[PDB]
Amino acid sequence: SLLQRQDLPYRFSAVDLDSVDGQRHYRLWLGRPLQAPPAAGYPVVWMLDGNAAVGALDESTLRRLADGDAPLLVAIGYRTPLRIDRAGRTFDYTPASPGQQRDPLNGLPSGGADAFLDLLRDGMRPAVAAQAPLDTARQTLWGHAYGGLLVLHALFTRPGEFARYAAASPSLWWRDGAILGERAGLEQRLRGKRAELLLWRGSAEPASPREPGQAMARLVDDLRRVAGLTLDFQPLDGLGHGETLGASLRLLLARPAVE
Ligand SMILES: C#CCNC(=O)[C@H](CNC(=O)[C@H](CNC(=O)CNC(=O)c1cccc(O)c1O)NC(=O)c1cccc(O)c1O)NC(=O)c1cccc(O)c1O
Numbered sequence: 001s002l003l004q005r006q007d008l009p010y011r012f013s014a015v016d017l018d019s020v021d022g023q024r025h026y027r028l029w030l031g032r033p034l035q036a037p038p039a040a041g042y043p044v045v046w047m048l049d050g051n052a053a054v055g056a057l058d059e060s061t062l063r064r065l066a067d068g069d070a071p072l073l074v075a076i077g078y079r080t081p082l083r084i085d086r087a088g089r090t091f092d093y094t095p096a097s098p099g100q101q102r103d104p105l106n107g108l109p110s111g112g113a114d115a116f117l118d119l120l121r122d123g124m125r126p127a128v129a130a131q132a133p134l135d136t137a138r139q140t141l142w143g144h145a146y147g148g149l150l151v152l153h154a155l156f157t158r159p160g161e162f163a164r165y166a167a168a169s170p171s172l173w174w175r176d177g178a179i180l181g182e183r184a185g186l187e188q189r190l191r192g193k194r195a196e197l198l199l200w201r202g203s204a205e206p207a208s209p210r211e212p213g214q215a216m217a218r219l220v221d222d223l224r225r226v227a228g229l230t231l232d233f234q235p236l237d238g239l240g241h242g243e244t245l246g247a248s249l250r251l252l253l254a255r256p257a258v259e
């Protein structure tokens, strides 16, 4: 319904791309404010699990976002009859394991994070930019769960591509905490750069799908020490895993725009 609605200060259009290997099929839903762009272009919020993200974009939030500096919204979804792709998303959002690849939860191929982030840079942003003027210095990357895992991979291993990284309920349990090890060396990689990281977790979430909060608390404590990184952790009282997707997105979009 959001995508057909005509009564909001955003209009949505689709930008379609395939993966370079031809195996995954994307549809980017672009939400453009009716507002004219700043001279330097719209700030941009990129959302993983795009078809879920669009389901979470409520009318009240979207009206308020039209505040004179409204962002371009880019929801990166899968262009399939079901509007999901379990195999595709499992591959695109997970990092490669240097030492040994297959997902420890569902057994499907894993390790496409860097190919996905390269496609974002080298194919998605080129396509999106041609539809609306972008301010490349004011970009956000958001994701939930495996999407959060991808966001952390991006920040930890290739900082600087985005100004703000937003990871909701990132799957820290994945491969016995493998993402936590990717943080080593971040301060060095951040030299000469600045980044913001927003984190969420729900009070009712378990530690994994099969000690809750402890890994996140340790990660937050560690990142608070990183020069060049501004960190904001928001616990979500009263929510479990599924519900932090929409909560994080509403709260993200209520924050002041990236500087
Ligand atoms: C279909 C599809 C892809 N999306 C999801 O699975 C999302 C987001 N979660 C994830 O991407 C990962 C990875 N999971 C998957 O991609 C699909 N889930 C499973 O295969 C699964 C298997 C066993 C037990 C589970 O809880 C699973 O979700 N899950 C977790 O990090 C996780 C952490 C704490 C508690 C959880 O329940 C989590 O799922 N999960 C939810 O929205 C969710 C909603 C209600 C109940 C759930 O168990 C959910 O996982």
Ligand SMILES: [Fe+3]
Binding pocket: 209, 241
């Ligand atoms: Fe689950």
